């Protein structure tokens, strides 16, 4: 039957076409993951319906209720058959859902307003003039919360108690904050999103320093789903064919505005 | 039996004494509402236990689940017997819980960093250079969300879509934001909290313009609770005895630091 795909509005993975109100179904969206879903579906031989995750979250488990939210939750509770989005492969998630090998590699990075005197995470941790934060949910926030590494521990300690809050609801908000804070706010996010934004007008942001870690995004399916095998092979095939690199260039650099 | 009082950490209504770790029970807290609870209990002849609302919220109903959160929720679901805090009497709340006549009068107001060229709500609505917001929950946010008054409608329209978010988690955060934004952020909050903060170091904030509305805080009890009658009479008695005004002066001006 028609496969239900859960995904999330995150540029340039999935975005509403400017003229979406005049369109219907899958045609309403565009982006790297929209193109990827089409390729995966073709190689696995299934028809699908793109749906945007109800709560706009990636996926975490509430420590008290033990309930999973976000795209991970939609898979865990059977609300969706597959997640095709910039969903980071992590230990906690790997335990409850299946993941294809990575379709994109990335790492946590620093985004600054051009001119900000910051070149690394160490730089940020050793000062207070420039505030810094992460998304209010997801693997980056979790990276800092769980890190036992001195420098990252120091940063988390500062972030968790910083006032006003240094956390944002969406990537768009973090970017807006960096752009409007006159260099007094730096944003910690995944290298992939950082690199995309660096090529977007008004071209006033920059990725600085090396990535804090090395990981990847994977296509997710409910644990034990018979669709997992084919999907994983499709990702490997698409990568080996150079299609994934082609898609990355298409949505990141081919039409960079900077 | 011992009455369970739900309240909230909001200065100067209820605050943790500096040395709370060395104290136990009700002795751990201090403030206007702590003193008020003692007076109400004495006049109604009951023993009580102060408890801080689990979710740190005042009280709203989720439009989807219809579940009440905050102090209102604790009363509605029988987790607490009475709420003694700066809980605003509103139509939606009055329908599900009982309220004593007001023990304090107030209205929505504007807090600015001294020197900010803003004298009214109209001023704020007609410009964009200075951002402004409210608590991310409670009667003030709701006032703007539901207002059909042109000026407030205009302000809500701007606030709801402003990026980054102009909403804060606690009063303390809104104050910190006003103080650290060099006049580029104004905070909308209740006159009572505004007046208290204006007398606190570093004495860099000011209440401007007249209040946007006129309302009051009431002591709340589960609907139909036999404790409601006595509590209401106690509030009226304490007010007529001048005790409420005495308490206001004690926690607002007697030890003002400005
Ligand atoms: N890919 C992450 C989400 C995320 O993590 N950090 C960010 O800035 C974003 Br967007 C995840 O799967 O949680
Ligand atoms: N008293 C209000 C809470 C509140 O509403 N606006 C604020 O700034 C605060 Br604190 C309520 O009962 O919701």
UniProtKB/Swiss-Prot annotation, chains A, B:
<feature type="site" description="Interaction with the cone snail toxin Con-ikot-ikot">
    <location>
        <position position="145"/>
    </location>
</feature>
<feature type="site" description="Interaction with the cone snail toxin Con-ikot-ikot">
    <location>
        <position position="61"/>
    </location>
</feature>
<feature type="site" description="Interaction with the cone snail toxin Con-ikot-ikot">
    <location>
        <position position="237"/>
    </location>
</feature>
<feature type="binding site">
    <location>
        <position position="190"/>
    </location>
    <ligand>
        <name>L-glutamate</name>
    </ligand>
</feature>
<comment type="function">
    <text>Ionotropic glutamate receptor that functions as a ligand-gated cation channel, gated by L-glutamate and glutamatergic agonists such as alpha-amino-3-hydroxy-5-methyl-4-isoxazolepropionic acid (AMPA), quisqualic acid, and kainic acid. L-glutamate acts as an excitatory neurotransmitter at many synapses in the central nervous system and plays an important role in fast excitatory synaptic transmission.</text>
</comment>
<feature type="binding site">
    <location>
        <position position="139"/>
    </location>
    <ligand>
        <name>L-glutamate</name>
    </ligand>
</feature>
<protein>
    <recommendedName>
        <fullName>Glutamate receptor 2</fullName>
    </recommendedName>
</protein>
<feature type="binding site">
    <location>
        <position position="86"/>
    </location>
    <ligand>
        <name>L-glutamate</name>
    </ligand>
</feature>
<comment type="subunit">
    <text>Homotetramer or heterotetramer of pore-forming glutamate receptor subunits. Tetramers may be formed by the dimerization of dimers. May interact with MPP4. Forms a ternary complex with GRIP1 and CSPG4. Interacts with ATAD1 in an ATP-dependent manner. ATAD1-catalyzed ATP hydrolysis disrupts binding to ATAD1 and to GRIP1 and leads to AMPAR complex disassembly. Interacts with GRIP2. Interacts with GRIP1. Interacts with NSF via its C-terminus. Interacts with CACNG2, PICK1 and GRIP2. Interacts with GRIA1 and SYNDIG1. Part of a complex containing GRIA2, NSF and NAPA and/or NAPB.</text>
</comment>
<feature type="modified residue" description="Phosphoserine; by PKG">
    <location>
        <position position="181"/>
    </location>
</feature>
<feature type="binding site">
    <location>
        <position position="140"/>
    </location>
    <ligand>
        <name>L-glutamate</name>
    </ligand>
</feature>
<feature type="site" description="Crucial to convey clamshell closure to channel opening">
    <location>
        <position position="118"/>
    </location>
</feature>
<feature type="binding site">
    <location>
        <position position="93"/>
    </location>
    <ligand>
        <name>L-glutamate</name>
    </ligand>
</feature>
<feature type="binding site">
    <location>
        <position position="88"/>
    </location>
    <ligand>
        <name>L-glutamate</name>
    </ligand>
</feature>
<feature type="topological domain" description="Extracellular">
    <location>
        <begin position="117"/>
        <end position="258"/>
    </location>
</feature>
<comment type="similarity">
    <text>Belongs to the glutamate-gated ion channel (TC 1.A.10.1) family. GRIA2 subfamily.</text>
</comment>
<feature type="modified residue" description="Phosphoserine; by PKC">
    <location>
        <position position="147"/>
    </location>
</feature>
<feature type="disulfide bond">
    <location>
        <begin position="203"/>
        <end position="258"/>
    </location>
</feature>
